[PDB]
Every structure is written in structure tokens, then in C-alpha cells.
Amino acid sequence: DNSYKMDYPEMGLCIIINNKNFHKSTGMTSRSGTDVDAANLRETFRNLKYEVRNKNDLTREEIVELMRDVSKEDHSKRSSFVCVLLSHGEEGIIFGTNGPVDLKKITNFFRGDRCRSLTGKPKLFIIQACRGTELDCGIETDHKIPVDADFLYAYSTAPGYYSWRNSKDGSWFIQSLCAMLKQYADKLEFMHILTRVNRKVATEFESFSFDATFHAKKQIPCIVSMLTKELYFYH
Amino acid sequence: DNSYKMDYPEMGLCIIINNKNFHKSTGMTSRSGTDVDAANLRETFRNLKYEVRNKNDLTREEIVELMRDVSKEDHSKRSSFVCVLLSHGEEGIIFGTNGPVDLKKITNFFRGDRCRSLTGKPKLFIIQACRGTELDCGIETKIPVDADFLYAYSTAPGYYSWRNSKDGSWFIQSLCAMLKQYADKLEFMHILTRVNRKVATEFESFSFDATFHAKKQIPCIVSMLTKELYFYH
């Protein structure tokens, strides 16, 4: 038994929080092309048999509330839980439409002791958000379990780094994550899929700007896993 | 291709910094039995065919200096790099015997653009050290310069990291056992996942004081790798 049981009646919920427009108070630009990501996410996860729910432009309180609500649902009949967050962010933070929420606040509602119907089951958080402003210039070669266990955080960039979005085909990360799931969910273990997503983002993408500051910039996602088992989407 | 090329003339260096004794000006206690971990790591990585270099009781300046020199060597005929840190720590920092060092400082030396001979090769940092003072209660039942790094931490962000003076740290004990049992079979992430499982289920702290009794730990795999890693072929 080296792998999560994925043959529960339901694969589980997949909450997509898609933040595009922010209050004037914050002075944060609108996230153009994000609806592409959300739509691509919704289809990809539907295909994987997840119960998708798309939420748009949530305030920091709306986020907390939604996460509290979901966490209190009964996941007995569910293999896993997925939550995709799409918005501005900083190290450890994502933005509601009105301001900042610590990721840790949203993820704690599911710690193996606050959400018992998800204990021993993979909690997955896909985070498409900046973790800072650093830009990657690139280089050339053209029993009892811990309550913090069974979590996987799939971040779109390294700690401290900016996260790139393309206005037309959505964010580099989400775009690659979806393509790679559609292609390999039936074959590969999740880490291996995410590893391929890493290569795709790292090699196939490069920013374009009239400003040399923001031109030719690279990106590597960051897979953070406290999973205790191999994760296969098929049985 | 999908898999890192591990057939260069050499596997590569495996620096192991192991700090047991800390200067009086620190107020830090000595890390009893850490040597157990150091030896266990030495043989394990020797058996993986790494050129093992052990360092003991380095200051914060010695650590920065050793890493700086290592990143300046020619790694052209090496497949990978491994650094193993065994010391006190805090979120994002480890301790030299005389005080703190930012981890980002020691790793920046090997960024794809600062250590060109390791560009495109797995950079492995194994870190046994606290990341905070929180205890887990447990529950019933062109390429990016920051790419090709892998951090294997002993605990989750913000948490204490448990050791046994006699038997070794929970994490290093499990990593070594798992590398021994599976380095010839599974890919690195799958080994590290076994490590998570083993630390999470087999270990539970004991204490006469309730505050420190029946605590649990989960290690934290942070991967920016772009390929699968097989220690063989």
C-alpha cells in the first residue's frame, strides 16, 4: 500500500477561486486572461471526475467563508480534495478582491484534525499567484498521523518570485498543468506529472516586453509535498 | 528526455555540514548524537558513489566560505550535487556554531548562473533542522536559474524537527533507510515520499511532560526539478 485509495465513490471537490477584478483601495491591476485558466481548469478536472465549483472575484472574507464551509462538508465518500487559487499574491499570501489572506489560514481549515472526513486523504492546493517580485533572468543552454500531512502545494513559481500570465492563453503554469494532466493523468503518478509541468514551464516559456526589465524572464514552479503516498488519478 | 543524466564520470560531491557544539555567545545547546546522522549519511551517500566530504562545527563564515569554494570547483564530469545540513535552525535559516545563516545565501552560490558547471544538473539540499518551534499534535487513525534545485526538509514550515540522541534524527534515520532500501528501484520523489510516510507513521515523541508528549512530524519535499532522478544507470 504505497498509494492513496482513489476508488472512493467520488474523486472529490475541486474549488476554483478565480480573482480577476480588485477594489480600487488595493490599487492592483486586473488579471487579464485568468478566465482562460478557470475554464481550462474546470474542463480538465471535470474530465478527471472531480466535482468542480467555480467562484469569481471573492473578497478576503468570502474566501475564508467558502473554505470554512467546504471544510465542514462531509467528504467521507470522496477520494481527495483539490483547491485552485487564481489571483495576485506575495510570499505566503493570496489576495481576495479587497485585500490579503494568509494561505495558511485557508489551508488550516483542512488540517487532518479540523476536517476528519479528509484525514489520510490527499489535500491539493494549486496556487497561481506571485510569491514576490524577484524576476528569474535565466541561464543559457537553449495509529496517529501529523496534522500537517497529506498536503500538496503546487505553486506556480519559486519563493520570492513573480508569476507570469499571458493575456491570451492564460498563465504559464495553469496552461502547462492542464496540458500535462490531460496527457498523463491516466499514466503517471502526480509528482511525475508536476515534474513534467516544471520542465514545460521552465523550457517552453519566456517573457516578452518592450521594457528590458521585464523582457526574456524565466520561471520554475515549485512543488511542495507532504504527501505520504503515491497519487494516481486512475485506478 | 524525462530523466536526469546520471552517467557522467562521477555522481558528484556530497558535502555534509554537521554542527554539534555552539559558541557560548549563542546560548545554544549542543546537538547530542548528531554524529550518528553524519555517519549514517556518509555511508549511504558513499554507497551511492558520491565523493563524500564531511565538515564539523563550522562557523557561519566557514559555512558560507565552504559553499562558495565548492560552487567554484569544476563540476563538469559530475552528474549532480548534494549538500546536507545538520544543525539548529529557523524558517529559512540554519546555524553556524557562532550564529545564523540565510539558506538562500548558501544555495544562491549554486544558482544555474553562478555555478555554470552544474547548470542543468540536480542540486540536492537535505536539511535537518528546526523551521520554527511549533509542535504537531497529530490526529487519530535558456532555463530558470532557480530550476533543478531540490530541498528535502525534515519538517513542514514553522515546525520543530525531532531527533533521538541515540538512534539519529527521525528524518535522516528514515531518509538513509529509504535510500538504502530503494535507491536502486524508485525515482527520488518516490523515495522521499516513502520517507514522509515512514516519519509520519512510525515516530511519536515521548515525554513525561504533556507539553512535549505524543508529538508527530511530517517532512517537506520542495522540488524545482524538471526531470525524474534515478540514482542508477
CSV table of C-alpha atoms in Angstrom, one decimal:
chain,number,residue,atom,x,y,z
A,1,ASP,CA,0.0,0.0,0.0
A,2,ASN,CA,2.2,2.8,-1.3
A,3,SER,CA,-0.5,4.8,-2.9
A,4,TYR,CA,-3.7,6.7,-2.0
A,5,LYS,CA,-7.0,4.9,-2.3
A,6,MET,CA,-8.7,6.8,-5.2
A,7,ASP,CA,-11.7,4.5,-5.8
A,8,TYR,CA,-14.0,6.2,-3.3
A,9,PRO,CA,-17.4,6.8,-4.9
A,10,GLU,CA,-16.3,10.4,-5.7
A,11,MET,CA,-12.9,11.8,-6.7
A,12,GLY,CA,-13.9,14.8,-4.7
A,13,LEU,CA,-14.5,18.6,-4.9
A,14,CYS,CA,-12.4,20.9,-7.0
A,15,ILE,CA,-12.9,24.6,-5.9
A,16,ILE,CA,-11.6,27.1,-8.4
A,17,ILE,CA,-11.3,30.6,-6.9
A,18,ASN,CA,-10.7,32.9,-9.8
A,19,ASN,CA,-9.9,36.5,-8.9
A,20,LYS,CA,-9.9,38.9,-11.9
A,21,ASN,CA,-11.1,42.3,-10.6
A,22,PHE,CA,-9.9,44.1,-7.4
A,23,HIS,CA,-11.4,47.0,-5.4
A,24,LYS,CA,-9.8,50.4,-6.0
A,25,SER,CA,-8.5,50.5,-2.5
A,26,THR,CA,-5.9,47.9,-3.3
A,27,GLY,CA,-4.6,49.6,-6.4
A,28,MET,CA,-4.0,46.2,-8.0
A,29,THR,CA,-4.4,45.7,-11.8
A,30,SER,CA,-6.9,43.4,-13.3
A,31,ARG,CA,-5.8,39.9,-14.1
A,32,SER,CA,-6.4,39.6,-17.8
A,33,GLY,CA,-6.5,36.1,-19.3
A,34,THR,CA,-7.4,34.4,-16.0
A,35,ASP,CA,-10.9,33.3,-17.2
A,36,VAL,CA,-9.0,31.2,-19.7
A,37,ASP,CA,-7.2,29.4,-16.8
A,38,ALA,CA,-10.5,28.9,-14.9
A,39,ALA,CA,-12.2,27.4,-17.9
A,40,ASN,CA,-9.3,25.2,-18.7
A,41,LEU,CA,-9.2,24.1,-15.1
A,42,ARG,CA,-12.9,23.3,-15.0
A,43,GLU,CA,-12.7,21.2,-18.1
A,44,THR,CA,-9.5,19.3,-17.1
A,45,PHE,CA,-10.9,18.5,-13.6
A,46,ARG,CA,-14.4,17.6,-14.9
A,47,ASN,CA,-12.6,15.1,-17.1
A,48,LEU,CA,-10.7,13.7,-14.1
A,49,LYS,CA,-14.1,13.2,-12.5
A,50,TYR,CA,-13.9,16.0,-9.8
A,51,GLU,CA,-16.9,17.9,-8.6
A,52,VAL,CA,-16.0,21.4,-9.8
A,53,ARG,CA,-17.3,24.6,-8.4
A,54,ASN,CA,-16.1,28.0,-9.9
A,55,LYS,CA,-16.1,31.1,-7.7
A,56,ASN,CA,-15.4,34.5,-9.1
A,57,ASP,CA,-14.0,37.7,-7.5
A,58,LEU,CA,-14.2,36.8,-3.8
A,59,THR,CA,-13.3,39.2,-1.0
A,60,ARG,CA,-10.9,38.0,1.7
A,61,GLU,CA,-13.9,37.2,3.9
A,62,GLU,CA,-15.7,35.4,1.1
A,63,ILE,CA,-12.6,33.2,0.6
A,64,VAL,CA,-12.4,32.4,4.3
A,65,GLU,CA,-16.1,31.6,4.5
A,66,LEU,CA,-16.1,29.4,1.4
A,67,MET,CA,-13.1,27.5,2.7
A,68,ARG,CA,-14.7,27.1,6.2
A,69,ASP,CA,-18.0,25.9,4.5
A,70,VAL,CA,-16.3,23.4,2.3
A,71,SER,CA,-14.1,22.1,5.2
A,72,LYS,CA,-17.3,21.4,7.2
A,73,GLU,CA,-18.9,19.4,4.4
A,74,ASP,CA,-18.8,15.6,4.7
A,75,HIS,CA,-16.0,14.1,2.5
A,76,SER,CA,-16.5,10.5,3.6
A,77,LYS,CA,-17.4,9.5,0.1
A,78,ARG,CA,-14.5,11.4,-1.5
A,79,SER,CA,-11.0,10.3,-2.5
A,80,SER,CA,-9.4,13.7,-2.4
A,81,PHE,CA,-9.9,17.4,-2.3
A,82,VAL,CA,-8.5,20.0,-4.7
A,83,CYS,CA,-8.4,23.8,-4.4
A,84,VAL,CA,-7.1,26.1,-7.1
A,85,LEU,CA,-6.4,29.7,-6.3
A,86,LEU,CA,-6.0,32.3,-9.0
A,87,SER,CA,-5.1,35.8,-8.1
A,88,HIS,CA,-2.4,38.3,-7.0
A,89,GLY,CA,-0.2,37.2,-4.1
A,90,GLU,CA,3.0,37.6,-2.1
A,91,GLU,CA,5.1,35.0,-0.2
A,92,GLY,CA,2.5,33.1,1.9
A,93,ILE,CA,-0.4,35.3,0.7
A,94,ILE,CA,-3.1,35.4,-1.9
A,95,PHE,CA,-5.4,38.3,-2.5
A,96,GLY,CA,-9.2,38.5,-2.1
A,97,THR,CA,-10.7,41.3,-4.1
A,98,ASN,CA,-10.4,43.7,-1.1
A,99,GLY,CA,-7.0,42.6,0.4
A,100,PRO,CA,-4.7,39.8,1.7
A,101,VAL,CA,-5.4,36.4,3.2
A,102,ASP,CA,-2.6,34.2,4.5
A,103,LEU,CA,-2.6,30.9,2.6
A,104,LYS,CA,-2.0,29.2,5.9
A,105,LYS,CA,-5.4,30.5,7.1
A,106,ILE,CA,-7.2,28.9,4.1
A,107,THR,CA,-5.2,25.7,4.3
A,108,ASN,CA,-5.7,25.2,8.1
A,109,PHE,CA,-9.4,24.5,7.7
A,110,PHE,CA,-8.4,21.2,6.3
A,111,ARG,CA,-5.6,20.1,8.7
A,112,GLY,CA,-6.2,16.4,9.5
A,113,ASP,CA,-7.8,17.4,12.9
A,114,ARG,CA,-10.2,20.1,11.7
A,115,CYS,CA,-11.5,18.1,8.7
A,116,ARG,CA,-11.9,14.5,9.8
A,117,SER,CA,-13.6,13.3,6.6
A,118,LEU,CA,-10.3,14.1,4.8
A,119,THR,CA,-7.8,12.5,7.2
A,120,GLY,CA,-5.4,10.3,5.3
A,121,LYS,CA,-6.6,11.7,2.0
A,122,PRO,CA,-4.6,14.0,-0.4
A,123,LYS,CA,-5.4,17.7,0.1
A,124,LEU,CA,-4.2,19.5,-3.1
A,125,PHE,CA,-3.7,23.3,-3.4
A,126,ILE,CA,-2.8,24.7,-6.8
A,127,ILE,CA,-1.6,28.2,-6.4
A,128,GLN,CA,-1.3,30.5,-9.3
A,129,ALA,CA,-0.1,33.7,-7.6
A,130,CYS,CA,3.1,35.8,-7.2
A,131,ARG,CA,5.3,34.9,-4.2
A,132,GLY,CA,7.2,38.1,-4.5
A,133,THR,CA,8.7,40.4,-7.2
A,134,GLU,CA,12.0,38.7,-8.0
A,135,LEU,CA,12.4,38.0,-11.7
A,136,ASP,CA,14.3,35.0,-12.9
A,137,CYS,CA,16.8,36.2,-15.6
A,138,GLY,CA,17.5,32.6,-16.7
A,139,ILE,CA,20.8,31.0,-17.8
A,140,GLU,CA,21.8,29.8,-21.3
A,141,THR,CA,22.0,26.2,-22.8
A,142,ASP,CA,19.0,26.6,-25.2
A,143,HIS,CA,-2.1,4.9,14.9
A,144,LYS,CA,-1.6,8.7,14.7
A,145,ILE,CA,-0.6,10.9,11.8
A,146,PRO,CA,0.8,14.5,11.8
A,147,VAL,CA,-2.0,17.0,11.2
A,148,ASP,CA,0.1,18.7,8.5
A,149,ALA,CA,0.4,15.5,6.5
A,150,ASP,CA,-1.3,14.6,3.2
A,151,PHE,CA,-1.0,18.1,1.7
A,152,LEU,CA,0.5,19.0,-1.6
A,153,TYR,CA,1.0,22.6,-2.5
A,154,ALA,CA,1.6,23.1,-6.2
A,155,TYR,CA,2.9,26.7,-6.6
A,156,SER,CA,3.4,28.4,-9.9
A,157,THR,CA,6.8,29.9,-9.0
A,158,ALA,CA,9.7,29.7,-6.6
A,159,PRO,CA,9.5,31.6,-3.2
A,160,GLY,CA,10.1,35.3,-3.7
A,161,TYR,CA,9.4,35.1,-7.5
A,162,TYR,CA,6.9,36.8,-9.8
A,163,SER,CA,4.4,34.5,-11.6
A,164,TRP,CA,3.8,35.0,-15.3
A,165,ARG,CA,0.5,35.3,-17.0
A,166,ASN,CA,-0.2,35.5,-20.8
A,167,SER,CA,-3.3,37.6,-21.6
A,168,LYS,CA,-4.4,35.2,-24.4
A,169,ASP,CA,-3.7,31.6,-23.3
A,170,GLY,CA,-3.7,32.2,-19.5
A,171,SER,CA,-0.9,31.7,-17.0
A,172,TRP,CA,2.2,29.8,-18.0
A,173,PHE,CA,1.7,27.4,-15.0
A,174,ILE,CA,-2.0,26.6,-15.3
A,175,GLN,CA,-1.8,26.2,-19.0
A,176,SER,CA,1.1,23.6,-18.6
A,177,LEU,CA,-0.5,21.9,-15.6
A,178,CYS,CA,-3.7,21.3,-17.6
A,179,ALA,CA,-2.0,20.1,-20.7
A,180,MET,CA,0.1,17.8,-18.7
A,181,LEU,CA,-2.9,16.3,-16.7
A,182,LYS,CA,-4.9,15.7,-19.9
A,183,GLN,CA,-1.9,14.0,-21.4
A,184,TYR,CA,-0.7,12.0,-18.3
A,185,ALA,CA,-3.3,11.7,-15.6
A,186,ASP,CA,-4.1,8.2,-16.9
A,187,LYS,CA,-0.5,7.0,-16.8
A,188,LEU,CA,1.8,8.9,-14.4
A,189,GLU,CA,2.0,9.4,-10.6
A,190,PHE,CA,1.2,13.1,-9.6
A,191,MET,CA,4.7,14.1,-8.7
A,192,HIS,CA,5.9,12.9,-12.0
A,193,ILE,CA,3.2,14.9,-13.7
A,194,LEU,CA,4.1,18.0,-11.7
A,195,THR,CA,7.8,17.4,-12.5
A,196,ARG,CA,6.8,17.5,-16.3
A,197,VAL,CA,4.9,20.7,-15.6
A,198,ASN,CA,8.1,22.1,-14.1
A,199,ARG,CA,10.1,21.3,-17.3
A,200,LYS,CA,7.4,22.6,-19.6
A,201,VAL,CA,7.2,25.9,-17.7
A,202,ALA,CA,11.0,26.1,-17.4
A,203,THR,CA,11.8,25.4,-21.0
A,204,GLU,CA,8.9,26.4,-23.2
A,205,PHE,CA,8.2,29.9,-21.8
A,206,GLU,CA,10.0,33.3,-21.8
A,207,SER,CA,8.5,36.7,-21.2
A,208,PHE,CA,8.2,39.4,-23.8
A,209,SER,CA,8.4,43.0,-23.0
A,210,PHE,CA,9.2,46.4,-24.6
A,211,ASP,CA,10.8,47.0,-21.3
A,212,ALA,CA,14.1,45.2,-21.0
A,213,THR,CA,13.5,45.0,-17.2
A,214,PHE,CA,10.6,42.6,-17.8
A,215,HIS,CA,11.9,41.0,-21.0
A,216,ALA,CA,13.2,37.5,-21.5
A,217,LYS,CA,12.3,36.4,-18.0
A,218,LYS,CA,12.0,32.8,-17.0
A,219,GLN,CA,10.0,30.7,-14.4
A,220,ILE,CA,10.1,27.5,-12.5
A,221,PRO,CA,7.1,26.3,-10.5
A,222,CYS,CA,7.7,24.8,-7.0
A,223,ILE,CA,6.2,21.5,-5.9
A,224,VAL,CA,5.8,21.3,-2.1
A,225,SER,CA,4.7,17.9,-0.9
A,226,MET,CA,3.9,16.4,2.5
A,227,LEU,CA,2.1,13.6,0.8
A,228,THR,CA,2.7,10.1,2.4
A,229,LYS,CA,1.8,8.1,-0.7
A,230,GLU,CA,1.9,7.9,-4.4
A,231,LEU,CA,-1.1,9.7,-6.1
A,232,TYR,CA,-2.7,8.2,-9.2
A,233,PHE,CA,-5.8,9.7,-10.7
A,234,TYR,CA,-6.8,6.4,-12.4
A,235,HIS,CA,-7.3,3.1,-10.7
B,1,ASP,CA,14.1,13.2,-22.2
B,2,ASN,CA,12.4,12.7,-18.9
B,3,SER,CA,15.2,11.6,-16.7
B,4,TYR,CA,18.4,13.4,-15.4
B,5,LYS,CA,21.6,12.0,-16.9
B,6,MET,CA,23.3,10.2,-14.1
B,7,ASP,CA,26.1,8.6,-16.2
B,8,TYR,CA,28.8,11.3,-16.1
B,9,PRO,CA,32.2,10.1,-15.0
B,10,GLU,CA,31.2,10.9,-11.4
B,11,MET,CA,28.0,11.1,-9.3
B,12,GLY,CA,29.4,14.2,-7.6
B,13,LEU,CA,30.2,15.7,-4.3
B,14,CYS,CA,28.1,15.3,-1.2
B,15,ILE,CA,29.1,17.9,1.3
B,16,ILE,CA,27.8,17.2,4.9
B,17,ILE,CA,28.0,20.1,7.3
B,18,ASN,CA,27.4,18.8,10.8
B,19,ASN,CA,27.4,21.2,13.8
B,20,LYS,CA,27.4,19.7,17.3
B,21,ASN,CA,28.9,22.4,19.5
B,22,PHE,CA,27.9,26.0,19.5
B,23,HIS,CA,29.8,29.0,20.9
B,24,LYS,CA,28.8,30.4,24.4
B,25,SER,CA,27.8,33.7,22.8
B,26,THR,CA,24.9,31.8,21.1
B,27,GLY,CA,23.1,30.4,24.1
B,28,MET,CA,22.5,27.3,22.0
B,29,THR,CA,22.7,23.8,23.4
B,30,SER,CA,24.8,21.1,21.9
B,31,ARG,CA,23.2,18.8,19.4
B,32,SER,CA,23.8,15.5,21.2
B,33,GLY,CA,24.2,12.4,19.0
B,34,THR,CA,24.1,14.3,15.7
B,35,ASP,CA,27.3,12.4,14.6
B,36,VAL,CA,25.1,9.3,14.3
B,37,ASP,CA,23.3,11.1,11.5
B,38,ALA,CA,26.5,12.3,9.9
B,39,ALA,CA,28.0,8.8,9.7
B,40,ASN,CA,24.7,7.3,8.5
B,41,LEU,CA,24.6,9.9,5.8
B,42,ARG,CA,28.3,9.3,5.0
B,43,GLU,CA,28.0,5.6,4.3
B,44,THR,CA,24.7,5.9,2.5
B,45,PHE,CA,26.0,8.5,0.0
B,46,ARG,CA,29.3,6.7,-0.2
B,47,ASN,CA,27.3,3.7,-1.3
B,48,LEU,CA,25.6,5.9,-3.9
B,49,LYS,CA,29.1,6.5,-5.3
B,50,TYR,CA,29.3,10.2,-4.2
B,51,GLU,CA,32.6,11.8,-3.2
B,52,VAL,CA,31.7,12.4,0.4
B,53,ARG,CA,33.2,15.4,2.3
B,54,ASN,CA,32.3,15.8,6.0
B,55,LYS,CA,32.6,19.1,7.8
B,56,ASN,CA,32.2,19.5,11.6
B,57,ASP,CA,31.5,22.5,13.8
B,58,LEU,CA,31.8,25.2,11.1
B,59,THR,CA,31.0,28.9,11.9
B,60,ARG,CA,28.5,30.9,9.9
B,61,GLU,CA,31.5,32.3,7.9
B,62,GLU,CA,33.1,28.9,7.4
B,63,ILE,CA,29.8,27.6,6.0
B,64,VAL,CA,29.4,30.5,3.6
B,65,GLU,CA,33.1,30.1,2.6
B,66,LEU,CA,33.0,26.3,2.1
B,67,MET,CA,29.9,26.6,-0.1
B,68,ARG,CA,31.5,29.5,-2.1
B,69,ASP,CA,34.6,27.4,-2.8
B,70,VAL,CA,32.5,24.3,-3.7
B,71,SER,CA,30.5,26.3,-6.2
B,72,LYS,CA,33.7,27.5,-7.8
B,73,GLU,CA,35.1,23.9,-8.5
B,74,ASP,CA,34.7,22.4,-11.9
B,75,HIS,CA,31.6,20.0,-11.7
B,76,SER,CA,31.7,19.2,-15.5
B,77,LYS,CA,32.3,15.5,-15.0
B,78,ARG,CA,29.8,15.2,-12.2
B,79,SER,CA,26.1,14.3,-12.6
B,80,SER,CA,24.7,16.0,-9.5
B,81,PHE,CA,25.4,18.0,-6.3
B,82,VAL,CA,24.4,17.1,-2.8
B,83,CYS,CA,24.6,19.3,0.3
B,84,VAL,CA,23.4,18.0,3.8
B,85,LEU,CA,22.9,20.4,6.7
B,86,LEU,CA,22.6,19.1,10.3
B,87,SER,CA,22.2,21.9,12.8
B,88,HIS,CA,19.8,24.2,14.7
B,89,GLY,CA,17.6,26.3,12.5
B,90,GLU,CA,14.7,28.7,11.9
B,91,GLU,CA,12.4,29.3,9.0
B,92,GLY,CA,14.7,29.8,6.0
B,93,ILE,CA,17.9,29.7,8.2
B,94,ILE,CA,20.5,27.3,9.6
B,95,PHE,CA,23.0,27.8,12.3
B,96,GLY,CA,26.7,28.0,12.1
B,97,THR,CA,28.3,27.4,15.5
B,98,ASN,CA,28.5,31.1,16.1
B,99,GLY,CA,25.2,32.3,14.6
B,100,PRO,CA,22.6,32.2,11.9
B,101,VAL,CA,22.9,31.9,8.1
B,102,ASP,CA,20.2,32.5,5.4
B,103,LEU,CA,19.7,29.3,3.5
B,104,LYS,CA,19.1,31.4,0.4
B,105,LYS,CA,22.7,32.6,0.7
B,106,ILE,CA,24.2,29.1,0.7
B,107,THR,CA,22.0,28.0,-2.2
B,108,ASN,CA,22.4,31.1,-4.4
B,109,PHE,CA,26.1,30.0,-4.8
B,110,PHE,CA,24.8,27.1,-7.0
B,111,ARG,CA,22.2,29.1,-8.9
B,112,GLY,CA,22.3,28.0,-12.6
B,113,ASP,CA,24.1,31.2,-13.5
B,114,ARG,CA,26.7,31.3,-10.7
B,115,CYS,CA,27.9,27.7,-10.9
B,116,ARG,CA,27.8,27.1,-14.6
B,117,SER,CA,29.3,23.6,-14.4
B,118,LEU,CA,26.1,22.5,-12.6
B,119,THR,CA,23.6,24.1,-14.9
B,120,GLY,CA,21.0,21.5,-15.8
B,121,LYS,CA,22.0,19.1,-13.1
B,122,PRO,CA,20.1,18.2,-9.9
B,123,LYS,CA,21.1,20.3,-6.9
B,124,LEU,CA,20.1,18.5,-3.7
B,125,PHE,CA,19.8,20.1,-0.3
B,126,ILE,CA,18.9,18.0,2.6
B,127,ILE,CA,18.2,20.0,5.8
B,128,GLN,CA,17.8,18.5,9.2
B,129,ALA,CA,17.0,21.5,11.5
B,130,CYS,CA,14.0,23.3,13.0
B,131,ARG,CA,12.0,25.6,10.9
B,132,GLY,CA,10.1,27.1,13.9
B,133,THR,CA,9.1,26.0,17.4
B,134,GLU,CA,5.6,24.6,16.6
B,135,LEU,CA,4.8,21.0,17.6
B,136,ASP,CA,2.3,18.8,15.7
B,137,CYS,CA,-0.3,17.2,17.9
B,138,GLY,CA,-1.2,14.6,15.3
B,139,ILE,CA,-4.6,13.1,14.7
B,140,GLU,CA,-6.4,9.7,15.3
B,141,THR,CA,-6.4,6.9,12.8
B,142,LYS,CA,17.6,29.0,-21.7
B,143,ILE,CA,16.4,27.8,-18.3
B,144,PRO,CA,15.4,29.4,-15.0
B,145,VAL,CA,18.4,30.0,-12.7
B,146,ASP,CA,16.3,28.7,-9.8
B,147,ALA,CA,15.5,25.4,-11.6
B,148,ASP,CA,16.9,21.9,-10.9
B,149,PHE,CA,17.0,22.5,-7.2
B,150,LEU,CA,15.5,20.1,-4.7
B,151,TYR,CA,15.1,20.8,-0.9
B,152,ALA,CA,14.4,17.9,1.4
B,153,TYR,CA,13.5,19.5,4.7
B,154,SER,CA,12.9,17.4,7.9
B,155,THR,CA,9.7,19.2,8.8
B,156,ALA,CA,7.0,21.5,7.5
B,157,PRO,CA,7.4,25.3,7.6
B,158,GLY,CA,7.2,26.7,11.1
B,159,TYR,CA,7.7,23.3,12.9
B,160,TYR,CA,10.2,21.8,15.3
B,161,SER,CA,12.3,18.9,14.0
B,162,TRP,CA,12.7,15.9,16.3
B,163,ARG,CA,15.9,13.9,16.9
B,164,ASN,CA,16.8,10.9,19.0
B,165,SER,CA,20.3,11.4,20.6
B,166,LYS,CA,21.0,7.6,20.4
B,167,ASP,CA,19.3,6.4,17.2
B,168,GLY,CA,19.6,9.6,15.0
B,169,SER,CA,17.1,12.3,13.7
B,170,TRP,CA,13.7,10.9,12.7
B,171,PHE,CA,14.2,12.3,9.2
B,172,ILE,CA,17.8,11.4,8.5
B,173,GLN,CA,17.2,7.9,10.0
B,174,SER,CA,14.3,7.5,7.6
B,175,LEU,CA,16.0,9.0,4.5
B,176,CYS,CA,19.1,6.8,4.9
B,177,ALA,CA,16.9,3.7,5.4
B,178,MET,CA,14.8,4.5,2.4
B,179,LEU,CA,17.8,5.3,0.2
B,180,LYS,CA,19.3,2.0,1.3
B,181,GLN,CA,16.1,0.1,0.5
B,182,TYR,CA,15.1,1.9,-2.7
B,183,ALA,CA,17.7,4.0,-4.4
B,184,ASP,CA,18.2,1.1,-6.9
B,185,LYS,CA,14.4,0.9,-7.6
B,186,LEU,CA,12.5,4.1,-7.3
B,187,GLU,CA,12.8,7.7,-8.5
B,188,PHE,CA,13.9,10.2,-5.9
B,189,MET,CA,10.5,11.8,-5.3
B,190,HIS,CA,9.0,8.3,-4.6
B,191,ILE,CA,11.9,7.6,-2.2
B,192,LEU,CA,11.2,10.9,-0.4
B,193,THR,CA,7.5,10.1,-0.3
B,194,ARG,CA,8.4,6.8,1.5
B,195,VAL,CA,10.4,8.9,3.8
B,196,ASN,CA,7.4,11.1,4.5
B,197,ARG,CA,5.3,8.0,5.2
B,198,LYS,CA,7.9,6.4,7.5
B,199,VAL,CA,8.5,9.5,9.6
B,200,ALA,CA,4.7,10.3,9.7
B,201,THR,CA,3.6,6.8,11.0
B,202,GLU,CA,6.5,5.2,12.8
B,203,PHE,CA,7.6,8.1,15.0
B,204,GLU,CA,5.8,9.7,18.0
B,205,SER,CA,7.6,11.6,20.7
B,206,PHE,CA,7.7,10.6,24.3
B,207,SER,CA,7.7,13.0,27.3
B,208,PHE,CA,7.0,12.9,31.0
B,209,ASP,CA,5.7,16.4,30.4
B,210,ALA,CA,2.4,16.6,28.4
B,211,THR,CA,3.7,19.6,26.5
B,212,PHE,CA,6.2,17.6,24.6
B,213,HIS,CA,4.5,14.2,24.6
B,214,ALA,CA,3.0,12.2,21.7
B,215,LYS,CA,4.1,14.7,19.0
B,216,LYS,CA,4.4,13.9,15.3
B,217,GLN,CA,6.3,15.1,12.3
B,218,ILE,CA,6.0,15.3,8.6
B,219,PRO,CA,9.0,16.1,6.3
B,220,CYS,CA,8.6,18.6,3.4
B,221,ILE,CA,9.7,17.9,-0.2
B,222,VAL,CA,10.3,21.1,-2.1
B,223,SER,CA,11.1,20.2,-5.7
B,224,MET,CA,12.0,22.6,-8.6
B,225,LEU,CA,13.4,19.6,-10.5
B,226,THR,CA,12.5,19.3,-14.2
B,227,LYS,CA,13.2,15.6,-14.6
B,228,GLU,CA,13.0,12.3,-12.8
B,229,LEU,CA,16.0,11.3,-10.7
B,230,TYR,CA,17.3,7.8,-10.6
B,231,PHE,CA,20.5,7.1,-8.7
B,232,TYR,CA,21.4,4.3,-11.1
B,233,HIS,CA,22.2,3.7,-14.8
